[PDB]
Design a binder for this molecule. Structure first.
Ligand SMILES: Nc1ncnc2c1ncn2[C@@H]1O[C@H](COP(=O)(O)OP(=O)(O)OP(=O)(O)O)[C@@H](O)[C@H]1O
Ligand SMILES: Nc1ncnc2c1ncn2[C@@H]1O[C@H](COP(=O)(O)OP(=O)(O)OP(=O)(O)O)[C@@H](O)[C@H]1O
Ligand SMILES: [Mg+2]
Ligand SMILES: [Mg+2]
Lengths: 396, 11, 832, 239, 407, 51
């Protein structure tokens, strides 16, 4: 357990009004940053052998990496070369006959194959990029409304790590695995990007299409790797966004290609709740269509809390507006209620386009102050792709 | 009915 | 291109600029009047690009020169306004500013908000570029800041308004222009900007922002700042100016919570109540009061804390047993092991074991000079009278954090501070320091004076002795005490210094100089006499104590250099250096969180001595603050191979979790105990860490910061520094003969509670939406300062970084910042 | 696949077509029915004229008999056909038995009209949830609500159409014996109740009131405006 | 008429009205970002130690010797023994991937030590059989067997007493008392294929059988049996079953058989048939070794693999009846901090047609309602609030307006 | 990027998995800086509502 390799977030500078309080706080972050660079650089310069040097001479360069398969004697193991062959190499003294485990990736001498070192942390480049290093920059205060949905997603991924006493003092096991579903543009991924900017646990991410490799076993083996790293790195959250790509309803497909995707779902379906129960690895799926996921992948036990994200309500839509018109410069005549009240199913991604557009309709008239007409026009210009589709005047 | 099919690649 | 309106406007402006070619009488007055109208009309409009400025791309050389010749009177000035306004769009600042300086005056409002601010910047730019070499240019610039600043005050631009004055270096006028609807925005801003601002402007801002609180009779707010500057005189005036007793009462409760004592004249009504409130005699009643509502009066036992059932009698572990029955049940007024069979318990501790156990007797009962002092009647006179130091620390510890009119600490301790036995004296001086920490009382300071010069006193007596004096005169730079410390420090010999306990002598020097970096230039000058290493070591450590909480990146950069160096007499200077960054940077959250990254780098790229200090350094940064990132960081080094790092990391965990009852920290602590079961040194302190993480069943915090984390507690910062530096050499100090030093924290031990009382002091259970505090600086209107709301029925507990707001408008608290004990005044505005 | 027929039970004993049928009622305009001591008020919202069509051919509140008025939701085509049958039933029973119809009976017949259509295939249910209100009880006011399922229910106050959940919740917490105690007070409640109209226009609220042994009275858009104003004046106590 | 922003226009938009700190502040933010970028690179490379042993346990002088005298030996298999004259055997050895060679022993080995078929080590140069090698213990298959017994006991599996009894007569009873199945001469079903709606207790009745095994329980992953290289799927199937016959009282549990048990179909133009030939190597294998299988979707299994010649017994895990749901509840609530009184019988009738897991989330959500509001006792009112969110909240629409028909 | 059909025997399931990638790439967990897309189509009703 290497511990949570949490993201690296620089502190936050607020005020945002671009006031001197802002400059000073950025300077303070810069000052320590300049200071911190000083120590790193001044540590190599200020900083100005006969035991390891002998070891590196026995190893030589380069050093192959094959898979250990059997420890025949204490000083002999069979190592399979990187091509799938086998070899009855010799186990030298410097290697630790403890870390040497069947399945471990062993460093092999190049000329005379002989175990020389055990290469832990051999996680694929395809799953070591899945780890979020630079934390996203959208804090829970950037998400407006969704207080009922946020709390549901904060009692499975944040609270169970800060106040564990509550849950274990009551007999629950903290809910682990939440399916964020709802219409497109409601905030599913933003709430996810917000748990990464608050959590202190390794936040692996996927896109539900990354874990479908072409090779027959490349697929199910990347998932078995991702949940090996998430478990390895202690507190972790695996965010499989757009889960609909891999986990759709199983069916008797007459196409081998489609029988390998399902052979990857039936791995994510067993790497979550199957024999040999999990450790501490929460999973946050997202999907705009919960009506096509397999009844098993969202069966209570793997996805315990199905957070439903409806289109914004009138009160939320008014809070959504301010979070995106916080940095804008509205004139005194910009009374947002004229646009919010409409019965148009204005999603939360629509609201940020009625903000980008109403700010660009301002440059049209050469104004950095958006008046009230700049929103009326923008609402129409931003509200297509949905036109108007409904019944005729049948119902009274 | 008519079914288009994908495919993998046994290395 | 343009249109009929745009192209014509280009020509109309083009004709006006061209017509100024000659000296025709009807070309200067007529044309300049037109430019005045068109430029004014567009600029005094919406943010629309000022078409006059876009069309007008002419050169002022012809009009600037003729300006002089062409009617140096009004006709000259008019041209200046047209060119000046055209300058703001372009980059001619020096000329752009000086045109409004010399050209037509008129008024700033007539041009436009965008113009006004641009003149604001240039005025600040010119003033900064104008030094004390000449005020002739200053009077005009100063006149400009006279008018413009009122312009911002009205236009929601207080930020620029405060920003404008700060740039000028002079911020007096805000006093005269702040409206009843503005002081909150301005006063909040300065308090937020003051921390970052460097010396001496930061100090000037505090008083000025303090002043603004004065003009509008917001007395409690003036209190918080008055202490921030740590100047008593302004406190005394507000004490004197408070014709309202209730505000007088409250501002004493904030004066007390800071541990600040001002001799109250009998002319002030309710002197005893103010004295008793300031003396902190009423604290004990509330604390016990708080317990009865919370139902935590029952004392705990070490076995339950450790949870021996889940895990798969040496004198040492008995101490860890003795300590945990300290901190854990400390201040609760009753312990199930140290009050009934104590003679039996201690007897299984060999000397220093007895010292620790006896001292916990006093810390088990804090803030009761009677109950504790009566719980101080069965040991001290022990057959092994060596434990007398033990109860003497208990004697002194009980008086720590409080002041009794009868001066018990000096009475009992004085008769034994001269006791010949070395151990008898250790408790005397140390316990006395705890009792009167920050008192600065001349008597006790004087009585402690001979202790320094008493040659017969052993070094361990001396090291505590200098520490004891320092803890009494913390943050006052007491000339007598400093002289005694400064005179005493010089006389030290080189051979006697090389011992570890001489590591404490410089500590006493700084503790006198905590929070005043201006006066520490001299103190570092005097220390230069002594020879190294301790000359350099004292210099650094004295340097750190000077800048406690200053937020001085300069000293931090200076301090970081010392740690950065790669050299044994240099490592003591380094170790105090890393702890230096922790203390200096721990005022602001922005810097403090950044010091973590620097601490982390010092560990991966650090060396033996540094790697030991880093675990301690993190301790001061987040005392009683279970930030997961820091708590995790201590763990990953909680198993380290070096014994010192393993101990320090374990102690840091205890501090970070002090009083937080963090389950994760406990579970983390329990697992470590199993891992280190073999090594008594680790097991002792990992068991100790579980002890600190349950300080007062969590009902206490060692955080040196009060008042929304803004008001520093000087006496507190003294304590943590003693144990932390003393931990710089744990084996000789902690693992050695000095288990008692851990009682140094008792100075900063404070309660964290949310008990709401009615106006009559009866507990008034008021719905109080309490959650994570969110800054209201820069947020227009009535921003919510509490997030993650969780309505609690007071009394309530506020983990560090939490703020409580009275969710019922029925009452209007006298002091704006709801921390500690607040007098809730029933709202006259509320109607049922 | 158990939703493409009217007499095919789902695995869990559900008549899904009837359940789908009540989906039309949720898509009509809000129609609230509150019964008072001497004036049983029933209102219609979302009047939503087209600006170029006369509103006489829109009437949604119809008097089934001289003593019983019927305000419906659901789909208009079926609403006219149900009202016509009910109007014929109120007279026909009068001829068969001299005494005129009561409110409960007509509701029982209307529920008897709908039910016989949902019972057998090859016939689509009426998709209207009608509020049956009428003083004809000869002393006691009584307002019922039908259901395209076929069950008639008696409520002291109701809400049908697009917004029943909002209106109904706001109606329980504001209906009391004190409120109904006055006639003008009784109407003030419905105008307040339907004041939660989709846009709260205040101008698209139509309330009709019938009184003991009285005649129906479609409030004119001058008395309603006054009542809308008066209710607004009463609501002006917030400040 | 959307006039394009003229260059003259752009200059003003960006300077007119600018807050005098704008250029500076935006400079500060830009400085930080580049500064952070540089900060990582100077330290981003974190040493990844390579598993060297402590300095004490080194023999560096002898280590140079092993690398110098000892030589790498390719691991091969003797596929035949020609026995040219019975005095010059001329063994044929397979080098796995290299090729098939007719080799002869190095003098060190004994002619009688290399028996046909046993793994034989050869020399890189001439391929002379230098040393015999132990039979192949698969690195993956060996890890498959559940070395740590699952903690779930049989008392945790509720409402499936007749389904557990039916399993205990095929997986436990014929393995502990092989005398009731002999007296009547009934051939014990040597495999059951647990099927049921997802989340009814298939894998819990699997871990439960593991906690009381007395056998060697092998947990077949499903993923590992589908390997990239052709054939390596079947090679694993054999090396698992082979690892069972060697053991006495071995149980194999192929969880999620759908992975490698899809209905056959000609798709040879692709790697799918690779997986299919891995099943046909499992169908041959199946038809003291008991076999279990779990499949939430049995209909996708090959008819051949569900015949009563391979999977003699098919236990159906149905949705619990009421007398079992009140029992599934008490099993998961025995550790909850519930108020003594809870009418669990009542909570069983509010979860109609609910699986054995959604009963669990009702117990897990019940507390979460008791944690949201600071009550340390999860009262009954919470559960009804729980059954509204776990079961009802996702059961169906069936709502008041459309439910005033049922009374 | 035509509307996502229900996964089954006959239904676009691979042009879908690449649609769910572009869908995430443009506005996904990782924000994109300075990349712009100019899709051009004829029928605008047959695209999935996420695109
Ligand atoms: N409730 C909300 N409050 C504030 N911003 C919101 C809200 N809902 C959506 N947004 C905005 O939506 C933007 C993008 O939408 P988001 O990433 O949340 O969608 P999604 O759930 O990932 O959608 P999809 O189904 O297409 O994957 C964010 O930048 C965010 O500012
Ligand atoms: N009938 C049940 N009785 C008790 N617990 C159950 C029951 N059904 C599910 N559970 C709970 O759910 C866990 C796993 O559910 P289960 O074993 O049924 O999964 P599964 O049938 O393998 O699902 P899938 O077939 O989709 O993989 C059990 O360990 C237990 O905690
Ligand atoms: Mg998304
Ligand atoms: Mg299973």
């Amino acid at each position: 357990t290497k511990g949570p390799d949490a993201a690296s977030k620089l502190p936050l500078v607020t005020p945002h009004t671009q006031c001197r309080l802002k400059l000073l706080k950025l300077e303070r972050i810069k000052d320590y940053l300049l200071m911190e660079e000083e120590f790193i650089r001044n540590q190599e310069q200020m900083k100005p052998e006969e035991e390891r040097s002998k070891v590196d001479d026995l190893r030589g360069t380069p050093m192959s990496v094959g898979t250990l398969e059997e420890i025949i004697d204490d000083n002999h193991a069979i190592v399979s070369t990187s091509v799938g062959s086998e070899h009855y190499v010799s186990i030298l003294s410097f290697v630790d006959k403890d870390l040497l485990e069947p399945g471990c990736s062993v460093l092999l001498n190049h000329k005379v194959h002989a175990v020389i070192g055990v290469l832990m942390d051999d996680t694929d480049p395809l799953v070591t990029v899945m780890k979020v290093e630079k934390a996203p920059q959208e804090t829970y205060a950037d998400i407006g409304g969704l207080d009922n949905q946020i709390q549901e997603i904060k009692e499975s991924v944040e609270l169970p790590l800060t106040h564990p006493e509550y849950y274990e003092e009551m007999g629950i096991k903290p809910p682990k695995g939440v399916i964020l579903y709802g219409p497109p543009g409601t905030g599913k991924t933003l709430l996810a990007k917000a748990v990464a900017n608050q959590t202190s646990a390794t936040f692996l991410r996927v896109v539900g299409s990354e874990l479908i490799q072409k090779y027959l076993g490349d697929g199910p083996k990347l998932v078995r790797e991702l949940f090996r790293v998430a478990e390895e790195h202690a507190p972790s959250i695996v965010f499989i966004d757009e889960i609909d790509a891999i986990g759709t309803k199983r069916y008797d497909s007459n196409s081998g290609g489609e029988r390998e995707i399902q052979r990857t779902m039936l791995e994510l379906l067993n790497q979550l709740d199957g024999f040999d129960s999990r450790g501490d690895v929460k999973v946050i799926m997202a999907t705009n269509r919960i009506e096509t996921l397999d009844p098993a992948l969202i069966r209570p036990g793997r996805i315990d809390r199905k957070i439903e994200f409806p289109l914004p309500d009138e009160k939320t839509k008014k809070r959504i507006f301010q979070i995106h018109t916080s940095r804008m410069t509205l004139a005194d005549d910009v009374t947002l209620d004229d646009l919010i009240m409409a019965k148009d199913d204005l999603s939360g991604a629509d609201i940020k386009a009625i903000c980008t557009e109403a700010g660009l309709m301002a440059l049209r008239e050469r104004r950095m102050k958006v008046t009230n007409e700049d929103f009326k026009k923008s609402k129409e210009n931003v509200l297509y792709k949905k036109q108007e589709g409904t019944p005729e005047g049948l119902y009274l | 009915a008519x079914x288009x099919x994908x495919x993998x690649x046994x290395x | 291109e343009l249109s009929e309106e745009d192209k014509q406007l280009q020509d109309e402006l083009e004709m006006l600029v061209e017509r100024l070619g000659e000296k025709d009488t009807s070309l200067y007055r007529p044309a300049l009047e037109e430019l005045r109208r068109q430029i004014r009309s567009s600029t005094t409009s919406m943010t629309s690009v000022p078409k006059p400025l876009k069309f007008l791309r002419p050169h002022y050389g012809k009009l600037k020169e003729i300006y002089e010749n062409m009617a140096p009177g009004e006709n000259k000035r008019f041209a200046a306004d047209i060119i000046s306004v055209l300058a703001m769009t372009m980059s001619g600042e020096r000329e752009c500013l000086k045109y409004r300086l010399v050209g037509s005056q008129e008024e700033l409002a007539s041009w436009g908000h965008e113009y006004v601010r641009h003149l604001a910047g240039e005025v600040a730019k010119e003033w900064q570029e104008l030094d004390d070499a000449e005020k002739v240019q200053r009077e005009p610039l100063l006149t400009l800041v006279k008018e413009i600043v009122p312009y911002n005050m009205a236009h929601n631009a207080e930020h620029e308004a405060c920003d404008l004055l700060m740039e000028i270096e002079q911020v007096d006028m805000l006093e005269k222009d702040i409206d009843e609807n503005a002081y909150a925005k301005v006063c909040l801003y300065l308090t937020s900007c003051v921390n970052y601002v460097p010396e001496p402007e930061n100090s000037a801002l505090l008083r000025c922002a303090l002043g603004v609180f004065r003009k509008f009779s917001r007395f409690p707010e003036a209190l918080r700042l008055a202490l921030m500057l740590n100047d008593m005189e302004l406190v005394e005036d507000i004490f004197t100016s408070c014709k309202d007793v209730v505000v007088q009462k409250q501002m004493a409760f904030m004066l007390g919570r800071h541990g600040v004592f001002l001799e109250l004249s009998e002319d002030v009504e309710e002197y005893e109540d103010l004295t008793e409130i300031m003396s902190n005699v009423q604290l004990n009643s509330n604390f016990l009061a708080l317990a009865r509502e919370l139902d935590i009066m029952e004392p705990k036992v070490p076995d339950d804390i450790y949870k021996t059932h889940l895990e798969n009698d040496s004198a040492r572990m008995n101490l860890a047993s003795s300590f945990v029955n300290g901190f854990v049940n400390a201040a609760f007024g009753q312990d199930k092991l140290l009050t009934d069979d104590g003679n039996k318990w201690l007897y299984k501790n060999k000397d220093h074991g007895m010292l620790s156990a006896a001292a916990s007797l006093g810390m088990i009962l804090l803030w009761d000079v009677d109950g504790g002092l009566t719980q101080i009647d069965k040991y001290l006179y022990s057959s092994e009278d060596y434990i007398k130091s033990g109860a003497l620390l208990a004697c002194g510890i009980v008086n720590s954090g409080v002041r009794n009119e009868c001066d018990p600490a000096l009475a009992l301790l004085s008769d034994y501070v001269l006791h010949n036995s070395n151990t008898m004296r250790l408790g005397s001086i140390f316990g006395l320091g705890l009792a009167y920490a920050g008192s600065n009382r001349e008597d006790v300071l004087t009585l402690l004076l001979p202790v320094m010069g008493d040659s017969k006193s052993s070094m361990e007596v001396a090291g505590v002795t200098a520490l004891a004096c320092g803890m009494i005169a913390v943050g006052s730079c007491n000339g007598d005490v400093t002289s005694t410390i400064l005179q005493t420090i010089m006389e030290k010999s080189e051979t006697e210094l090389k011992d570890t306990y001489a590591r404490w002598l410089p500590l006493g020097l700084g503790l006198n100089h905590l929070g005043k970096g201006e006066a520490i230039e001299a103190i570092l000058a005097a220390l230069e006499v002594v020879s190294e290493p301790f000359r350099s070591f004292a210099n650094t450590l004295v340097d750190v104590c000077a800048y406690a909480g200053s937020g001085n990146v300069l000293k931090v950069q200076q301090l970081l250099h010392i740690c950065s160096e790669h050299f044994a007499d240099m490592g003591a200077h380094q170790g105090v250096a890393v702890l230096g960054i922790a203390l200096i940077a721990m005022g602001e959250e922005i810097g403090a969180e950044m010091a973590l990254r620097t601490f982390g780098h010092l560990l991966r790229y650090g060396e033996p001595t540094l790697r030991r200090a880093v675990p301690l350094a993190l301790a001061l940064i987040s005392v009683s603050n279970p930030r997961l990132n820091i708590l995790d960081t201590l763990s990953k080094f909680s198993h380290d191979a070096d014994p010192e790092v393993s101990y320090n990391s374990i102690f840091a965990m205890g501090m970070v979790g002090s009083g937080t009852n963090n389950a994760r920290l406990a579970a983390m602590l329990r697992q470590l105990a199993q891992y280190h079961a073999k090594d008594p040194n680790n097991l002792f302190m990992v068991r100790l860490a579980q002890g600190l993480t349950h300080l007062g069943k969590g009902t206490l915090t060692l955080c040196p910061y009060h008042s929304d984390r803004q008001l520093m507690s000087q006496v507190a910062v003294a304590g943590l520094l003693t144990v932390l530096v003393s931990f710089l050499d744990v084996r000789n100090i902690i693992l050695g003969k000095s288990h008692y030093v851990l009682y140094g924290l008792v100075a900063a031990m404070q309660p964290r509670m949310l008990v709401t009382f009615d106006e009559e002091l009866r507990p008034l259970p008021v719905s109080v939406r309490v959650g994570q505090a969110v800054d209201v600086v820069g947020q227009a209107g009535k921003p919510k300062t509490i997030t993650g709301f969780q309505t609690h029925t007071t009394p309530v507990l506020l983990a560090h970084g939490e703020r409580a707001e009275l969710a019922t408008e029925e009452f209007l608290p006298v002091t704006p910042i709801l921390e500690g004990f607040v007098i809730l005044r029933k709202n006259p505005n509320y109607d049922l | 696949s158990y939703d493409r027929a009217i007499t095919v039970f789902s695995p869990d004993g559900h008549l899904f077509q009837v359940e789908y049928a009540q989906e039309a009622v949720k898509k009509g305009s809000t129609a609230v029915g509150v019964r008072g001591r001497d004036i049983v008020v029933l209102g219609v919202e979302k009047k939503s004229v087209a600006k170029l069509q006369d509103e006489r051919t829109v009437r949604k509140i119809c008097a089934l008999d001289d003593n019983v008025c019927m305000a419906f939701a659901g789909l208009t085509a079926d609403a006219r056909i149900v009202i016509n049958r009910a109007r014929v039933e109120c007279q026909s029973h009068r001829l068969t038995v001299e005494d005129p119809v009561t409110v409960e009976y007509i509701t029982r017949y209307i529920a008897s009209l709908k039910q016989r259509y949902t019972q057998s295939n090859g016939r689509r249910p009426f998709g209207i949830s009608a509020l049956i209100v009428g003083f004809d009880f000869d002393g006691t006011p009584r307002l019922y609500q039908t259901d395209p399922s076929g069950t008639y229910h008696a409520w002291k106050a109701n809400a049908i159409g697009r917004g029943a959940k909002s209106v109904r919740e706001f109606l329980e917490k504001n209906y009391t014996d004190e409120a109904i105690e006055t006639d003008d007070l009784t109407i003030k409640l419905v105008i307040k109740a339907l004041l939660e109209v989709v846009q709260s226009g205040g101008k698209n609220i139509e309330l009709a009131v019938m009184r003991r042994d009285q005649s129906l009275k479609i409030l004119n858009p001058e008395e309603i405006e006054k009542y809308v104003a008066e209710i607004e004046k009463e609501k002006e106590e917030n400040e | 008429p959307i006039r394009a922003l003229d260059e003259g226009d752009i200059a003003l938009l960006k300077t007119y009205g600018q807050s005098t700190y704008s250029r500076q502040i935006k400079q500060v933010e830009d400085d930080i970002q580049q500064l952070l970028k540089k900060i990582n690179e100077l330290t981003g490379i974190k040493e990844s130690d390579t598993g060297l042993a402590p300095p004490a346990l080194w023999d560096l002088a002898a280590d140079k010797q092993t690398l110098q005298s000892e030589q790498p030996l390719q691991v091969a298999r003797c596929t035949k023994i020609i026995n040219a004259d019975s005095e010059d055997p001329k063994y044929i050895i397979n080098v796995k991937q290299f090729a098939k060679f007719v080799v002869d022993l190095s003098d060190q080995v004994a002619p009688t030590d290399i028996e046909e078929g046993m793994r034989v080590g050869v020399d890189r140069n001439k391929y002379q059989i230098h040393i015999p090698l132990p039979p192949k213990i698969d690195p993956t298959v060996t890890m498959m067997q559940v070395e740590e017994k699952p903690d779930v006991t049989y008392s945790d599996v509720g409402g499936c007493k007749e389904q557990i009894e039916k399993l205990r007569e095929v997986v436990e009873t014929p393995l502990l008392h092989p005398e009731r199945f002999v007296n009547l001469g009934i051939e014990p079903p040597k495999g059951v294929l647990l099927f049921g709606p997802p989340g009814t207790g298939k894998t819990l009745c699997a871990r439960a059988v593991a906690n009381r095994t007395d056998a060697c329980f092998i947990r077949v992953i499903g993923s590992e049996l589908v390997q990239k290289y052709v054939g390596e799927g079947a090679r694993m199937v054999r090396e698992l079953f082979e690892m069972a016959r060697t053991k006495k009282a071995c149980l194999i549990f192929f969880d999620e058989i759908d992975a490698i048990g899809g209905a056959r179909f000609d798709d040879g133009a692709g790697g799918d048939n690779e997986v299919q030939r891995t099943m046909l190597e499992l169908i041959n294998q199946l038809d003291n070794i008991k076999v279990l299988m779990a499949t939430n979707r049995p209909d996708t299994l090959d008819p051949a693999l569900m015949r009563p010649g391979r999977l003699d017994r098919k236990i159906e895990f149905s949705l619990p009846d009421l007398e079992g749901r009140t029992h599934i509840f008490k099993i998961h609530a025995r550790s909850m901090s519930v108020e003594r009184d809870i009418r669990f019988e009542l909570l069983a009738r509010l979860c109609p047609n609910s699986t054995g897991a959604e009963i669990r989330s009702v117990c897990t959500e019940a507390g979460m309602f008791a944690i949201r509001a600071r009550r340390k006792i999860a009262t009954e009112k919470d559960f009804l609030e729980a059954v509204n969110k776990v079961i009802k909240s996702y059961a169906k629409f069936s709502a008041t307006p459309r439910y005033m028909t049922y009374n | 990027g035509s509307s996502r059909l229900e996964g089954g025997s006959g239904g676009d399931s691979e042009v879908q998995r690449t649609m769910l990638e572009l869908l995430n790439q443009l506005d996904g967990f990782e924000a994109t800086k300075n990349i712009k897309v100019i899709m051009a189509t004829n029928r605008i009703d047959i695209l999935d509502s996420a695109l």
